[model samples]
Target: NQPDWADEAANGAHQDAWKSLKADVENVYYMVKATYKNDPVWGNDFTCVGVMANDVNEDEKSIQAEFLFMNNADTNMQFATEKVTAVKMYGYNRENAFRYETEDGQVFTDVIAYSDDNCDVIYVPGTDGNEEGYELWTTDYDNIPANCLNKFNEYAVGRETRDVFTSACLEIAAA
Candidate 1:
């Protein structure tokens, strides 16, 4: 079992945890074409969420997800809150690790790590002012970071869960 959504972290766990998760969190930009299910009437909202290990360090106990977006029904919606209302949970298998290299020779990595509720996705400029970390929000997948794809495909191909392999945030219900 894991912490509940209503659960609170230890004193200052919020700040420390977010700062830690943000450092290693990579942005996958796509302006993903999101569609709504049942539009909520007034006083309700919807959201796309994720769960993962802390990116800054190998602490499986610290995990989080995206906050519920306001009025996210019938119409496409993005996270309505800046804060994700975090909970300490474990979603990924901690023992896994993966390596990645950018097109410009920049190297980075991620393991069977927990995801967060943050949804600030955008493009980053490389030395030549070109975009990197672009995400194609389609089932058509490509091996952008060959090493990562290999590791991901091996460990996450229905190995654990669909979310385990793809970084695509999951949609869940919220108020």
Candidate 2:
């Protein structure tokens, strides 16, 4: 029921090899099995949500997923620390609509179709332990390409924490 070439290619160890790089799950907020404390600050100069892939073909262009933690939903507006009620996931490529600020000053979105498509760095905004508005947090790895990005491994090997609850698939998958 299948072509030989298709089967051979699918069976090729490279597909399996992809797993060797790592399984960087995107949405695990609900499953936060452990709680780690740190007034960790994200996004200072880049997008609030960012990603890193280890197996990205160095010479080929591929998509990286952006997992946005939208705090205000139900209407379009830039997110602020106060009156915030929800977090939503919006995936986008790095090139197109990357970020937006609404007239009501309530929501911000990265309009890119695939944040990782051509992006070398990853972004995650920081909070001063409060959620009024997101500020960019810069890192050396923020704009690094997938092929050279190697930070996820450090996180995966660490303690497994409980997840945060979310309804977005991409957010969960990438977590």
Candidate 3:
């Protein structure tokens, strides 16, 4: 068994610490903000089936997330929506941000990986088979502040090539 470092490190008991740093998770579309190129779980950017989480319940700790898989087993695109398909997810908040279940192992992944005063960008750390370290961001990559992006770079580098899913490939799959 590996050491349980990430668990304690991501404890949801810091919101009271961040100055007025309340995390918004409900009705929010947190995209699979970023990943590693050729990640074992998500595969590649075009085929990774980017995800967006919504309908989070604080009392029930349940969530409704949707994703467009480029191609399922039958060679056809599919939408994995919790309301319709029941992907079976749970979400919870500890302090500054919340964590939710990922596709693999039902791992409770931190939506906000790194946070600071600005909290500009949300990014996950790379390596150690932590493929589910995806961020829950407000929107796509347009104006992610440099401070947070730099932290993402520092933590994600020396491990693997970075891959940011724009969802442009899956967005047009409806046609």
Candidate 4:
């Protein structure tokens, strides 16, 4: 028993569309580049953990991923990389000339929007007033180091080598 509008919105085609997106996954690893703070960074950048993409909305320009932290519980995070307005991939770039602000009013001056074989970087300005500079995070696509790749080869054994295993959900559903 459901309202007609709600039922129409959540019907079979919508469910199947999600299923296809879930099956289309991308593996990525995340590492912290720098944290300019006397206060603290939430997760350590020293270690590189993996992220598995569940759904990527090409229309909306976002990615929803499950970030796998080694020896920690799973955390689901979303990135609106589509809204990225500026990037600094090289040189001594402290910040971007232009900034993007979320609808809620958070502002970011820089983005690491490299979408090739290398790692993808996305960052948000630290909310902590005491924190000094932007905290950098990395999402590596195919550039897993040789040492880590060797380890995966040993563990998975013929199941396509991957450092870690991590999901699928929604993007823009049809109206």
Better of 2 and 3 by lDDT: 3
- Residue 86, candidate 1: Cα error in Å is 11
* Candidate 1 lDDT tens digits, 45-138: 2223322322333343222223222333435434321222122223421222222233345432322222223321211112223322211121
Cα lDDT for residue 173, candidate 2: 47
If the candidates were sorted by their TM-score against the true structure, best first, what order would they fall in? 3, 4, 1, 2
TM-score for each predicted model, relative to the true structure: 0.25, 0.19, 0.48, 0.32
Window of ten residues with lowest summed lDDT in model 1: 131-140
Q: Which candidate, 1 or 2, would have the higher lDDT against the true structure? A: 1
- Residue ranges of candidate 1 with Cα displaced over 4 Å: 1-20, 24-73, 82-143, 159-175
Q: Least accurate stretch of 10 residues (summed lDDT) in model 3?
A: 83-92
State candidate 1's TM-score. 0.25
In model 4, residue pairs whose N, Cα or C atoms come closer than 3 Å (at least 3 residues apart or on different chains), thus clashing, are none
The per-model lDDT (C-alpha) reads 0.27, 0.24, 0.39, 0.32
Per-residue error (Å), model 4, residue 91: 20
Model 2 Cα lDDT, one tens digit per residue, 1-175:
3212112233232112112112222221111111222212222221223333332332332223223332222222122221111122222112222222223454332211112222211122322242222111112222434431232222223433222212331333453
Please provide, for model 4 over 72-140, each residue's C-alpha lDDT reduced to its tens digit, 9 standing for 90 to 100. Answer: 222443233212223222232322122434455555443322212323222233443434232222343
Query: In candidate 4, which residue ranges exceed 4 Å CA deviation?
Result: 1-24, 36-48, 70-110, 113-115, 121-124, 127-175
Report the number of the highest-lDDT candidate. 3
- Candidate 3 C-alpha lDDT tens digits along 1-175: 3212223345333222122122222222323335444343434443434455565554554555665544223355545544212111123334333343445534332334445443323433333355534342333434455655665565555554343434444445463
